[PDB]
């Protein structure tokens, strides 16, 4: 499993800030937009993009405040991410896209798709944000930690002061061990504690047990949209999962129209780090099937 990030930096001005993105593959055709979540960057896509790049343009931005993107003094609310990702997409002049989305990148992608349904030709998604009706529907092993994250004094001490999301939670969302080189790539954007705001706001935005109400509403609205939409869908899932346990993937594979589900074997949250060759190969082959009517 490759540790290298062999992609030239691309930058675009977005709302008076600069965002970093990977941009590889042919210039023409429908682009494939890859959206990472918490607490990763375009680095999470590094071993999946090589399967897609031969046939499609691959675009993998770093969310505002993350990766090699700028770090303005925001609260990094989901609303901030929405504002910046909307402006990113318009800044590149993207018309129709295929979405490949994960964790908070999936909340961005589904929310955008809902608002721009004629521009989304396909969605591949994994370990995505859905409402977690109660804390019992959150994995027991992660329950105490995410409950602690979702306070101001304790949460901010763990995530901002001690960097527990990067040093602890991240490696514990992968079944295989992350190497030191991989950890250093994930650490790089957050070496300065003041830049860790996004790592703390994100778990505080998770729609868990009806809170926060604004995120719960927005997430229910896109999961309704997704159940009504004929858009081609590709769902990767792992055992035991974190956001998406196997029973939920089984349910969505049937409830979502035009949905193919693929089992990656053992995984938790960062499925990309446990089976990148399967995810990359299935995306590439599924993209080809979008052109078979
Ligand atoms: C969008 C949704 C994203 C989900 C991504 C994450 O998926 C859920 C995974 O949740 C894991 C929750 N658990 C922890 O974060 C955690 C602990 F609760 C915990 F008690 C400990 C611990 O100290 O034992 C660790 C942990 C840490 C914690 C802190 C830390 N540092 C601060 C400076 C260094 C380092 C670690 Si490490 C990588 C040495 C570690 C290793 C293990 N194992 C089991 C075999 C090696 C276990 C825990 C920790 C937590 F990460
Ligand atoms: Cl999170």
Residue numbers in the entry: 4 to 296
What does the paper say about this structure?
Here we describe WHaloCaMP, a modular chemigenetic calcium indicator built from bright dye-ligands and protein sensor domains. Fluorescence change in WHaloCaMP results from reversible quenching of the bound dye via a strategically placed tryptophan. WHaloCaMP is compatible with rhodamine dye-ligands that fluoresce from green to near-infrared, including several that efficiently label the brain in animals. When bound to a near-infrared dye-ligand, WHaloCaMP shows a 7× increase in fluorescence intensity and a 2.1-ns increase in fluorescence lifetime upon calcium binding.
To construct a bright, near-infrared chemigenetic Ca2+ sensor for use in animals, we focused on the JF669-HaloTag ligand. This dye-ligand has emission just on the edge of the near-infrared and has previously been reported to efficiently label neurons in mouse brains following intravascular injection. Unfortunately, the optimal range of KL–Z for bioavailability shows little overlap with the optimal range for environmental sensitivity. Thus, the excellent bioavailability of the JF669-HaloTag ligand is at the expense of environmental sensitivity; this dye-ligand does not exhibit large Ca2+-dependent fluorescence changes when used with the previously published HaloCaMP sensors. Instead of tuning the lactone–zwitterion equilibrium to find a dye with suboptimal bioavailability and environmental sensitivity, we hypothesized that we could generate Ca2+-binding-induced fluorescence changes via reversible quenching of the dye by tryptophan from the protein through PET. Mutating G171 on HaloTag7 to a tryptophan decreased fluorescence emission of bound JF669 by 85%, providing a way to strongly modulate the dye fluorescence emission. We next sought to couple the fluorescence quenching of HaloTag-bound JF669 to Ca2+-induced conformational changes in the protein. We explored different topologies of peptide calmodulin (CaM) insertions into HaloTagG171W at positions spatially proximal to the bound dye and screened for insertions that retained a high dye-ligand-capture rate close to that of HaloTag7 (above 106 M−1 s−1)17 to ensure good labeling with dye-ligand following bolus loading into complex tissue. Insertion of the myosin light-chain kinase (MLCK) CaM-binding peptide followed by CaM at position R179 of HaloTag7G171W resulted in a protein with a fast dye-ligand-capture rate and a modest Ca2+-dependent change in fluorescence.
